[PDB]
């Protein structure tokens, strides 16, 4: 989730963005610097 402050300047993290928070597909792709890997991940999510 993006609180809309300065958190998008910090390196993405799967645990705090997609597990502690609800993340968007783009937010997850920001972590897996590979699109296909993100899709895979999303099938679970």
């Amino acid at each position: 989730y993006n609180s809309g402050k300065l958190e998008e300047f910090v390196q993405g993290n799967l645990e705090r963005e997609c597990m502690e928070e609800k993340c968007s597909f783009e937010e997850a792709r920001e972590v897996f610097e590979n699109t296909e890997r993100t899709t895979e991940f999303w099938k679970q999510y």
């Epitope: 402050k5 300065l6 300047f9 390196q11």
Partner: antibody
Framework: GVQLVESGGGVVQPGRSLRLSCAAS????????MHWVRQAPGKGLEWVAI????????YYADSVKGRFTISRDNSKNTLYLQMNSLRAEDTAVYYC?????????????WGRGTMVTVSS | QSVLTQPPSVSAAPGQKVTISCSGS????????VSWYQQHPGKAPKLMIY???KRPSGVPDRFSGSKSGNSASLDISGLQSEDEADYYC???????????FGTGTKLTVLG
């Protein structure tokens, strides 16, 4: 350990241009966002800019919007502050600062600044 | 703007306690975490407290923080000579989209 050293400071005429450098070491420079903070003689701290860990995004204080440019070279582990159209108000010690790994709002490590005197 | 008001000076004897207030507004303190920085005369600023009351490793337990409304406080107990320095609070401002530093407070350990 986390080391940050600013370079490029000195006297410069108003309306001129100067580039500051910040050599970083002791950490994976690429995974961290960086800040620039300055302090005029006998004054308080003043935020200047911030750049994302990868160089993508960046914000500026209205005081330097349009004149200064913040950049970095993640292969050389260096941070840059390109100052143009310098003024007298830019006279100050310029500090390089690292943002915490999970919070840009936190500057966990600073370096000793570099003095910048803008005078004719 | 930089508003974030702080008392220009606070002091107490070695071993006593002191508290430094950081008065801001909703745009900053009200909705953002406050960090505190220590600055000795000719040294690089140092992070003492972040996210209102979190202490980095290394920072003495005698340093603690608090927040209430649009104000934040840095509390220092058992003052030691090395605590004498300038302190600055800091918070992001949603409205200005800028990181603000308080006006600064000089903490002197009475000698």
């Amino acid at each position: 350990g986390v080391q940050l050293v600013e370079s490029g400071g000195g006297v410069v005429q108003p309306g001129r241009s100067l580039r500051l450098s910040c050599a970083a070491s002791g950490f994976t420079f690429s995974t961290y966002a960086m800040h620039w903070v300055r302090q005029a003689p006998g004054k308080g701290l003043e935020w200047v800019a911030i750049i994302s860990y990868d160089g993508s995004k960046k914000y500026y204080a209205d005081s330097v919007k349009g004149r200064f440019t913040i950049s970095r070279d993640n292969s050389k582990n260096t941070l840059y502050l390109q100052m143009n159209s310098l003024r007298a108000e830019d006279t100050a010690v310029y500090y390089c600062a690292r943002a915490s790994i999970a919070a840009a709002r936190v500057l966990d490590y600073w370096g000793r600044g570099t003095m910048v005197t803008v005078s004719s | 703007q930089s508003v974030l008001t702080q008392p220009p000076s606070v002091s107490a004897a070695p071993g006593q306690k002191v508290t430094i207030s950081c008065s801001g507004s909703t745009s900053n303190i009200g909705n953002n975490y406050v960090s505190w920085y220590q600055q000795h005369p000719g040294k690089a600023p140092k992070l003492m407290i972040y996210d209102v009351s979190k202490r980095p490793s290394g920072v003495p337990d005698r340093f603690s923080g608090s927040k209430s409304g649009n104000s934040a406080s840095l509390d220092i107990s058992g003052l030691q000579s090395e605590d004498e320095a300038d302190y600055y609070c800091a918070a992001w401002d949603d409205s200005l989209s800028e990181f603000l530093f308080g006006t600064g407070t000089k903490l002197t350990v009475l000698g």
